[PDB]
């Protein structure tokens, strides 16, 4: 009976985001089109994360905003066939009241982390993190292990699950660099809290490893009373190892509020029907949805649609050849998309801006991981980065595992793909892949580096 109870409590969370978005569209007097504008969804999603964040950086990152009791951003309206941008300012107390009213009195912080994860996934598909890796002394080819790297600093347990091996390594390495340059970083009251933060991140990263030797190496890193070069080296060693010996990184398909809003509006009872982020529910919901996006004059709308599709399905870090078989169209690496980002900057010219319908559908659905061996080669930059390296018996054990798994390539995991009509997953399809296609989203990447406006 517990399986249906998880579905009901997740559905209850979804339904509250839906009712909240409907009430917000209503307050703002947004049309059906404006309500389904993904830029409007972002502003409303951020408004409620900002109303509960209270400048702690738990659900959001904002530039310091003007009046602490007020929050807002850009709402876009179609006046006389043209898109206009307006800066709204809503009372944080009032936003919190609408959020709680939408969730039948409950605080529903799971609804907030759900929207925060959606933002993180959209950032993982939009902006590059290569210069950030270089600044921490890390190999920029660790770009494929950067799940949830734009998450806000105080994102708790809900953020930890979706973070990658490289994200945890980058975070822990930044602390070790501060301790190396300044011993006072591990002293006093600040040092006591940083030590507990360090031990927490170590156990979160350790939990992500799936071998005995990698977890045992994380114990050595964690027990180190004064972290220095030897801890940085082990962490980067384990990050290189995570390119072949894949870790346990939770990938959550979190949709925008302008997807949950219309489904709730049409009477879908998410609490009663149940909802699961794993499987058909997000794919089925995107088939029954209609979302729009503001687009720039030189952007391809099929490319803007792919970026949003990848963000919806938390697919930025998946093998492109796998995503192409599931979507039914060829999914291109970020360096081949002629699009620059969903969010409209304050300095952009709205007079040239147009709108387009986002293609968020998929040929097949699939589930998060007598069979036929269906292999996919490791990408060229993955093998060079993973085999870039002082000595230990756990290091030789990890090297032995990395060298024996390497010729085996990446086998597709799970029992095939499913037609959208097959809701019970009883008729799997053979997944074919054109092994000549790149396979990594970040190959030849030219996307803007992540920055807070």
Ligand X SMILES: COC[C@@]1(C)COC[C@@H](COc2ccc(-c3cc(C(N)=O)c(=O)[nH]c3C(F)(F)F)cc2)O1
Convert residues 274-303 into a mask of x (bound to ligand X by CB under 6 A) and - (unbound): ---xxx--x---------------------
Judged by CB under 6 A, the residue of 388, 413, 432, 446 near ligand X is 413
- Beta carbon nearer to ligand X, 369 or 452: 369
Residue 355 main-chain phi, psi, to 5 deg: -125, 155
Q: How far is the CB of 416 from ligand X (least distance, A)?
A: 10
Give 449's DSSP letter. B
Give the integer Cα–Cα distance in Å for 162 and 149. 9
Q: Which residue has the tokens 């902006």?
A: 127
Helix, strand, coil shares, percent, the chain, to 5: 50, 10, 40
CA angle 191, 193, 198 (to 5 degrees): 90
- Binds ligand X (CB under 6 A): choice among 181, 346, 369, 436: 369
Q: Which two tokens stand for residue 245?
A: 């010996």
CB closer to ligand X, 42 vs 410: 410
Other Cβ atoms less than 10 A from the Cβ of 410: the count is 19
CA distance linking residue 349 with residue 126, whole number of Å: 21
Give whichever of 228 and 328 is closer to ligand X, judged by the CB atom. 328
Q: Of the two residues 70 and 368, which places its CB atom closer to ligand X in the complex?
A: 368
Q: How far is the CB of 375 from ligand X (least distance, A)?
A: 9
* Shortest Å distance, C-beta 32 to ligand X: 26
Indicate which single residue of 40, 71, 121, 253 sits in contact with ligand X (rule: CB under 6 A).
Answer: 253
Kindly tell me which residue out of 160, 175, 311, 376 binds ligand X, with binding defined by CB under 6 A. Answer: 376
As a whole number of angstroms, the distance between CA 209 and CA 398 comes to 11
Residue 363: name the closest of 391, 333, 322 by CA. 322
Q: Long-range contacts of range 4-8, CB-CB < 8 Å, 24 or more positions apart? A: 4/274, 6/276, 7/274, 7/275, 7/276, 8/271, 8/272, 8/274
Nearer to ligand X, 16 or 164 (CB): 164
Please state, in angstroms and rounded to a whole number, the distance separating the CA atoms of residues 117 and 10. 14
CA–CA separation, 388 and 248 (whole Å): 22
- Cβ proximity to ligand X: between 38 and 311 the closer is 311
Contact between 198 and ligand X per CB under 6 A: no
Q: Which of residues 225-244 bind ligand X (CB under 6 A)?
A: none
DSSP designation for 63: -
Tally of CA atoms within 13 A in the half-sphere of 320 that contains its CB: 23
Using CB under 6 A as the binding rule, the residues of this chain from 311 to 340 that contact ligand X are 313, 315, 318-319, 322-323, 326
Q: Which stretch binds ligand X (CB under 6 A): 225-233, 339-347, 398-406, 412-420?
A: 412-420
Instruction: Determine if residue 124 is labeled as part of a ligand binding site.
Output: yes
Encoding tokens for residue 117? 């994860």
- Consult the annotation and say whether 120 binds a ligand: yes
Q: Does 368 bind ligand X (CB under 6 A)?
A: yes
Nearer to ligand X, 54 or 434 (CB): 434
Contacting ligand X (CB under 6 A), which of 412, 433, 441, 443?
A: 412
Closest approach of Cβ 305 to ligand X, in Å? 14
Q: Binding-site residues for Mg(2+), please?
A: 120, 124
Residues at the site binding ligand X, with contacts judged by CB under 6 A: 253, 277-279, 282, 313, 315, 318-319, 322-323, 326, 366-369, 376, 410, 412-414
């Amino acid at each position: 009976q517990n399986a249906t109870e998880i579905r009901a409590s997740v559905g209850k969370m979804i339904g509250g985001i839906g009712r909240f978005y409907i009430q917000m569209c209503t307050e703002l007097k947004l049309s059906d089109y404006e309500g389904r504008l993904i830029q409007n969804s972002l502003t409303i999603e951020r408004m409620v994360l900002s109303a509960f964040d209270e400048r702690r950086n738990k659900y959001l990152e904002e530039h310091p905003g003007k009046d602490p009791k007020k929050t807002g951003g850009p709402i876009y309206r179609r006046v006389n066939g043209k898109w206009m941008r307006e800066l709204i300012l809503y009372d944080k107390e009032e936003i919190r009241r609408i959020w709680r009213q939408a969730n039948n009195g409950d605080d529903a912080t799971a609804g907030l982390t759900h929207m925060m994860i959606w933002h993180s996934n959209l950032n993982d598909a939009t902006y590059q993190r290569t210069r950030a890796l270089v600044r921490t002394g890390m190999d920029p080819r660790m770009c494929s292990l950067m799940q949830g790297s734009t998450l806000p600093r105080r994102s708790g347990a809900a953020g930890a699950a979706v973070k990658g091996v490289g994200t945890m390594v980058m975070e822990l390495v930044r602390m070790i660099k501060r301790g190396i340059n300044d011993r006072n970083f591990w002293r006093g009251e600040n040092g006591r809290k940083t030590r507990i933060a360090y031990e927490r991140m170590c156990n979160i990263l350790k939990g992500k490893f799936q071998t005995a030797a990698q977890k045992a190496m994380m114990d050595q890193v964690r027990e180190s009373r004064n972290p220095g070069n030897a801890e940085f080296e082990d962490l980067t060693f384990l990050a290189r190892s995570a390119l072949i010996l894949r870790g346990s990184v939770a990938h959550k398909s979190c949709l925008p509020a302008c997807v949950y809003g219309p489904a709730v509006a049409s009477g879908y009872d998410f609490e009663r029907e149940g909802y699961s982020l794993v499987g058909i529910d997000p794919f089925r919901l995107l088939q029954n949805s209609q979302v729009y996006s503001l687009i720039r004059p030189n952007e391809n709308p099929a490319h803007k649609s792919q970026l949003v599709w990848m963000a919806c399905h938390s697919a930025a870090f998946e093998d492109l050849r796998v995503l192409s078989f599931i979507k039914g169209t060829k999914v291109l690496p970020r360096g081949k998309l002629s699009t620059r980002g969903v969010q409209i900057a304050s300095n952009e010219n709205m007079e040239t801006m147009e709108s387009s319908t986002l293609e968020l559908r998929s040929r097949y659905w699939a589930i998060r991981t007598f069979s036929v061996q269906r292999n996919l080669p490791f990408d060229r930059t993955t093998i060079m980065a993973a085999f870039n390296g002082r000595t230990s018996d756990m290091r030789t054990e990890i090297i032995r595992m990395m060298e024996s798994a390497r010729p085996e390539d990446v086998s597709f995991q799970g029992r095939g793909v499913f037609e959208l009509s097959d809701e019970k997953a009883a008729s799997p399809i053979v997944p074919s892949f054109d092994m000549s296609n790149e396979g990594s989203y970040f190959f030849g990447d030219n996307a803007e580096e992540y920055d807070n406006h």
